[PDB]
Amino acid sequence: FQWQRNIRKVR
Numbered sequence: 821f822q823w824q825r826n827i828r829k830v831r
């Protein structure tokens with residue numbers, strides 16, 4: 821839940 825659609829911004 822912390823990044824299920826946000827890993828390319830949080831690289």
Ligand SMILES: *C(=O)CCCCCCCCCCC
Pocket residue numbers: 821822823824825
């Ligand atoms: C949400 O984005 C999923 C990935 C983030 C890491 C979850 C870590 C906790 C897993 C164990 C839960 C009991």
